[PDB]
Amino acid sequence: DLADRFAELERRYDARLGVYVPATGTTAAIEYRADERFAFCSTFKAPLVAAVLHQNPLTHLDKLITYTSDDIRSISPVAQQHVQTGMTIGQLCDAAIRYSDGTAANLLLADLGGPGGGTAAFTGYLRSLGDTVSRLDAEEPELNRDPPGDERDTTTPHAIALVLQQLVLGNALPPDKRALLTDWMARNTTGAKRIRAGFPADWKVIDKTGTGDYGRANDIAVVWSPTGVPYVVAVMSDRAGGGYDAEPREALLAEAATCVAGVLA
Amino acid sequence: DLADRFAELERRYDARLGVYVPATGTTAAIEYRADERFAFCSTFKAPLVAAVLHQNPLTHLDKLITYTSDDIRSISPVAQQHVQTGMTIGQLCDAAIRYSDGTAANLLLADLGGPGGGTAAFTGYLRSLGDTVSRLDAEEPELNRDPPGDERDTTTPHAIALVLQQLVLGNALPPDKRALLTDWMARNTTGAKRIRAGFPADWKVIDKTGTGDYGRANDIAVVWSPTGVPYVVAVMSDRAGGGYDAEPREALLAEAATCVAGVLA
Amino acid sequence: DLADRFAELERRYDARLGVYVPATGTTAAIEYRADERFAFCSTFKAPLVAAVLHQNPLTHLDKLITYTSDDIRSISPVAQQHVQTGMTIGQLCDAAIRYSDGTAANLLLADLGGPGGGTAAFTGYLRSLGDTVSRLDAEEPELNRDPPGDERDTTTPHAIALVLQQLVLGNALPPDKRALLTDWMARNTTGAKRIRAGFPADWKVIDKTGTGDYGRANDIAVVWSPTGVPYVVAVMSDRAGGGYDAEPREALLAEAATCVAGVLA
Amino acid sequence: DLADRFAELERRYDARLGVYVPATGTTAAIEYRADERFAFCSTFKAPLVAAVLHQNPLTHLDKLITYTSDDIRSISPVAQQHVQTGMTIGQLCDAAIRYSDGTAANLLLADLGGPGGGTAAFTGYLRSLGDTVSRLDAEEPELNRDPPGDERDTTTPHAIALVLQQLVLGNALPPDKRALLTDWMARNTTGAKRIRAGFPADWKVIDKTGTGDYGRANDIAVVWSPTGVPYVVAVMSDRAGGGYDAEPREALLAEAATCVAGVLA
Ligand SMILES: *C(=O)/C=C/N[C@@H](C(=O)O)C(C)(C)S(=O)O
Ligand SMILES: *C(=O)/C=C/N[C@@H](C(=O)O)C(C)(C)S(=O)O
């Protein structure tokens, strides 16, 4: 019956909304277009960091990577600053999550190795976690601007929420590695107007945002009740019928998050 | 069906919940035990101030009232500080709303004059905005400790919400007087953990709290959506079965307010 | 020569300014009216918690203290909410520092025990730290309203700065207790517009504020440079010539703090 | 005096500092190597935009420019994305200021037309604002790597401050053109760690950064005191002697800006 409010929000914002909240021990699952495909955009950077963490020892984070000015091919607020000094795999992880750095994601994909510069390796890592649906085919920034209807560089709310649940709440990572991913998402800077804005302030929120053309605006998050119960909230949206240049509407994601918060209360 | 969530909240906190949100042009009215009597507690201090404002000129706020240490009969954080200097009606209004000062309320009641120390005048003022249900019979602090089932010093979420709607949104006061009430409720200090804690931070919240024995915890509020749509939210609660010494559960009001926010989004 | 910029601020704000920054290993001390007496106001609440910490085991923080409505004699944003339940010595500490709770401070003083409700015990604890100047003679809220010139309830910037240096940077407390005082001062809610507003955001700031009649506005703080060098900044002000009702000017303290920051850079 | 602190920061960071703050009605001018030549680096992109604005109508911002992958010759986070669609002068203005886009800068230079790809037309526009000293001779990225001592592609903190003063505070642009420049500088993404990091957060800061070889790091900024008084702060630094590969030290610029803030308080 909450699916009437979501469809009302889709009408209001001229957009398509996708919502998934995995069912917990006490409460039931929340689904709206939960098995419809939305574009990853930058949300893939969260399990990308987890893939590098799972495949390498903790001391692989101190390895220095250097890059040229020709590698800065997308918005890279941190990689742009360190073209002469270079950056370690740890700082690349910090940048790729907290500042959604495009270049940091592409080098992290390269560190994964393999065909397509690491896209195949990344999709393989998602498969190991049980995600049968998601797929990454391009690197930054081409992945953001796939045409609508094309299945490349897409996930689903259902699929991405279950990946995030294992990475933060489950056992996909050892505790010392799981605490680094969690801390990076807790100190994220790009999502203050989305799921964070939809939930009361005494609910803790860690998230990774995603934005691209065709009005694409995503936010995947883990949230904690004031009493400590954790939930996973996957919210994805696009406005593909409005064309390539359609503006994303962050208010839709905040409003949807407020609907969810009332149900989880 | 939001009525299931409220009765769930009643079972979880061992309490009786009363919720009223007046219907606006866009949304429908929210009701849960909306026409069941709850105790005013300190929520009456909001229409009390508006009563003094309505019956008097603005310069009546500069009238100085002196009192003795025998008049301090309830929680009076501000009145206790000025026993030798005295307080103006204006300060007595500020104290009674922002700090829920008990003695300032009793003096303001005396400023309404008449039988029962100005209770009869106050209920009469309540009949003028159209509220034939509510009634104030005692002064501070006795009004907080009436037995359950007794109809003295009681209002209802339905009754109190419509009063507040006229006083803040309607025309029960002139604009100059209407702004002083709202500024005192905006900078209130006693309700951070109730309705304010249940709504997202980009919603604006003005409120007057009430607390008393039998686990009585109330919060009456005017809220504003991030786009500026105002609503009235009346949340009242008691735990009479737990007896006279039952602890009030503020988390219940915060939780109920999050449910309301989800529907209003 | 920085004493010219301070006296210019004194002229601009119609106020008397006291500033002390203890000399560190590299840099020299900063003094302005550094051995002149200013009123403690609520800055005493910081070493008061330290005095309770020093005099008791860590499990004494779990002791439940109960109080009545007649103990609320000043602004007590937290103690006013827990009259029915009571508060633990830990919560009383947290409230007295973070919200500058007046009643919580008076109960902590009483926990020290002794003449004057524990004021003598407090003044003795300062003497043990090497403070020969300060004195606390009254309780809240009488200590904020002593006449000017009166030595009662007065410290000096020099004296209070060296007390705070021992309590946070020195060895006047064991590490497990010292981290509790530091964490309460780091999460203070009352001093965003004073020394915090005067220092750049990449400087860490812990503080305790003081405010009272005669335009009295103090802020005692420990700050950390972006590279980790700690400094102690004692800033006090009053406007006694402006009368009992003179308004404190927080802009003076933030401005004075910006002058100090330039010298410490 | 303040010039001893600057030379101390010089010793500590192994650099040569250049600081100019144009004197206002109230305060005196700040100078330190103010008429010594530093390399423009990317700070020229600030008056470059104003040049296009000044000699063109508002409709010229919608002119579309197309370019090849052979024109991408330096760090161009925005120009790399639009090689097949092309960018308009307006977007090229936005990119060249907010992301210090190199290829956007070179296209805007060519939009000024003339010898040296519009370097002569740019220096010419600088002479119209009274700047006899500054000169731009190369295009991106050759201008960032001129040897020390060489006078090509150099300004001075004195010479770069007054142009910016005219271009943001003065009448070098009509108001409708002046606000586009200001809004792009206000939303800059490349200078959080420099002058912005040295001033308290309740000061407003707009800036354009510059970075190049030989440890060159600049920041030209307009700041606003919390009460509204605007100033111009030109901070330039390099580390010749340390070599072509010397790393720029941003902490120097932030430290120098904190010294300026103390004087201006
Ligand atoms: C993750 O893939 C997204 C980046 N989105 C934004 C960004 O901050 O870079 C855009 C919209 C600017 S982008 O598609 O590069
Ligand atoms: C200590 O500095 C505290 C001030 N708190 C209040 C109090 O009850 O004392 C005030 C603000 C009313 S005061 O300045 O006395």
Side-chain angles (χ1 to χ4, degrees), chain A residues 1 5 9 197-200 202 255 258-259 261-263 265, chain B residues 5 9 12 197-200 202 255 258-259 261-263 265:
Chain A
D1 207 30
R5 213 154 316 135
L9 273 282
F199 276 86
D202 63 357
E255 280 209 73
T258 307
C259 289
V263 152
Chain B
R5 210 160 301 129
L9 282 163
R12 201 211 304 169
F199 277 83
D202 58 7
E255 275 309 270
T258 303
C259 300
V263 158

Side-chain angles (χ1 to χ4, degrees), chain C residues 130-212:
Chain C
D131 184 356
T132 176
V133 166
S134 284
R135 53 183 297 183
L136 188 68
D137 309 293
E139 287 202 331
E140 285 267 5
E142 283 85 348
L143 73 143
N144 311 293
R145 68 160 210 168
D146 285 333
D150 181 347
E151 296 193 330
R152 287 181 312 188
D153 310 321
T154 70
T155 180
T156 69
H158 195 173
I160 192 71
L162 294 179
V163 171
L164 189 63
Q165 178 174 58
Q166 294 188 240
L167 292 176
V168 160
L169 299 180
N171 275 279
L173 273 162
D176 60 336
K177 288 173 169 112
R178 207 186 335 146
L180 271 186
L181 183 71
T182 295
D183 165 74
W184 285 323
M185 285 181 59
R187 289 165 30 243
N188 172 219
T189 82
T190 64
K193 297 195 156 3
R194 309 196 175 183
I195 295 177
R196 178 64 276 184
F199 277 83
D202 66 3
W203 289 57
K204 211 191 154 123
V205 167
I206 71 166
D207 75 314
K208 176 85 202 74
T209 60
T211 315

Side-chain angles (χ1 to χ4, degrees), chain D residues 9-217:
Chain D
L9 298 197
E10 293 209 280
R11 269 180 278 147
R12 200 210 299 162
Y13 289 100
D14 205 28
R16 176 179 75 120
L17 197 53
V19 187
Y20 195 80
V21 184
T24 67
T26 155
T27 66
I30 292 176
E31 324 161 299
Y32 187 75
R33 305 204 194 289
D35 305 303
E36 298 207 24
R37 292 183 171 275
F38 291 86
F40 263 124
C41 288
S42 316
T43 68
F44 91 90
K45 290 159 196 175
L48 171 55
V49 167
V52 202
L53 298 168
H54 151 89
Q55 60 164 95
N56 288 80
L58 301 116
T59 89
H60 174 79
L61 292 188
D62 286 295
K63 166 144 306 175
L64 174 137
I65 294 71
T66 51
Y67 48 112
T68 37
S69 78
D70 232 5
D71 299 318
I72 317 278
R73 276 149 42 93
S74 54
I75 292 161
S76 315
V78 191
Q80 281 263 34
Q81 300 191 204
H82 300 200
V83 180
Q84 68 254 91
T85 66
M87 256 178 316
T88 70
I89 292 282
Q91 304 169 326
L92 286 143
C93 283
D94 194 296
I97 276 192
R98 293 197 329 123
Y99 298 88
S100 197
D101 196 286
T103 283
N106 281 355
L107 286 181
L108 279 190
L109 286 188
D111 179 85
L112 275 273
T119 52
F122 174 74
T123 324
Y125 174 69
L126 287 181
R127 301 280 184 266
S128 75
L129 310 159
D131 191 341
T132 279
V133 168
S134 294
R135 48 183 294 171
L136 188 75
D137 309 61
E139 242 174 16
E140 276 266 11
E142 277 72 20
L143 69 169
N144 303 298
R145 37 207 58 156
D146 283 334
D150 188 10
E151 287 186 332
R152 284 141 32 163
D153 303 306
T154 69
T155 173
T156 64
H158 189 171
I160 194 62
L162 290 171
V163 171
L164 190 58
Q165 182 210 291
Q166 278 168 76
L167 290 177
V168 172
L169 297 184
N171 269 303
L173 282 167
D176 69 343
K177 272 167 234 222
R178 201 197 310 112
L180 269 90
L181 193 60
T182 302
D183 165 72
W184 285 319
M185 288 185 167
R187 294 163 27 241
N188 170 54
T189 84
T190 71
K193 282 270 172 143
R194 307 201 175 182
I195 293 192
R196 175 66 275 183
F199 276 81
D202 59 339
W203 293 59
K204 185 32 149 151
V205 174
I206 78 191
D207 81 317
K208 174 81 201 71
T209 62
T211 311
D213 308 290
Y214 301 73
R216 310 189 150 119

Side-chain angles (χ1 to χ4, degrees), chain A residues 33-57:
Chain A
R33 310 196 181 288
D35 304 296
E36 296 200 16
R37 287 185 171 276
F38 291 85
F40 259 121
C41 301
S42 318
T43 59
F44 90 92
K45 287 164 194 169
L48 173 72
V49 160
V52 179
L53 283 198
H54 160 266
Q55 178 171 144
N56 290 157

Side-chain angles (χ1 to χ4, degrees), chain B residues 9-256:
Chain B
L9 282 163
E10 288 187 308
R11 276 178 323 249
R12 201 211 304 169
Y13 289 100
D14 201 10
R16 177 177 74 115
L17 196 55
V19 180
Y20 194 78
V21 172
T24 168
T26 286
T27 80
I30 271 178
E31 316 184 324
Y32 189 76
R33 306 199 185 294
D35 300 303
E36 297 204 22
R37 298 181 163 275
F38 290 81
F40 262 126
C41 290
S42 297
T43 63
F44 91 91
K45 285 157 195 173
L48 182 60
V49 167
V52 187
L53 302 165
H54 159 266
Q55 270 185 7
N56 305 267
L58 254 205
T59 63
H60 174 74
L61 292 203
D62 280 307
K63 176 142 217 233
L64 175 134
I65 292 67
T66 53
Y67 50 102
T68 165
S69 266
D70 282 274
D71 305 321
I72 319 277
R73 277 297 208 130
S74 175
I75 303 263
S76 314
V78 192
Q80 201 114 42
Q81 293 208 22
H82 295 100
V83 192
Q84 80 285 328
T85 57
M87 305 202 294
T88 67
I89 295 275
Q91 301 172 329
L92 283 138
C93 285
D94 191 272
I97 281 189
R98 292 194 330 123
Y99 298 98
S100 192
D101 191 293
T103 281
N106 275 355
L107 291 195
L108 277 189
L109 287 154
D111 184 83
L112 279 315
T119 55
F122 171 81
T123 322
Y125 179 68
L126 284 185
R127 299 284 186 268
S128 74
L129 311 155
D131 191 2
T132 77
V133 164
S134 325
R135 55 181 288 169
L136 188 71
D137 309 53
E139 286 184 275
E140 281 265 11
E142 285 72 13
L143 78 154
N144 299 297
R145 42 192 66 149
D146 281 328
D150 189 8
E151 299 209 317
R152 291 202 314 262
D153 309 317
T154 65
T155 172
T156 64
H158 189 176
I160 201 55
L162 288 173
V163 173
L164 191 58
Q165 172 165 63
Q166 273 166 78
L167 292 173
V168 175
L169 263 43
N171 289 120
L173 282 170
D176 67 332
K177 272 162 200 160
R178 186 163 11 98
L180 281 92
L181 192 61
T182 302
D183 169 72
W184 287 324
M185 278 169 89
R187 298 160 331 112
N188 171 62
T189 88
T190 73
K193 293 301 191 191
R194 307 200 180 187
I195 290 177
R196 170 69 275 179
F199 277 83
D202 58 7
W203 293 60
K204 212 214 262 213
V205 172
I206 54 160
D207 79 317
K208 174 79 202 72
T209 54
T211 313
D213 304 311
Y214 301 81
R216 278 161 186 158
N218 320 318
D219 210 10
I220 44 151
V222 185
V223 298
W224 284 270
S225 78
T227 68
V229 201
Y231 308 79
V232 174
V233 190
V235 196
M236 324 206 85
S237 80
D238 61 41
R239 313 210 297 122
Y244 175 87
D245 298 327
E247 289 196 54
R249 294 235 214 288
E250 288 187 312
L252 169 79
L253 312 182
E255 275 309 270

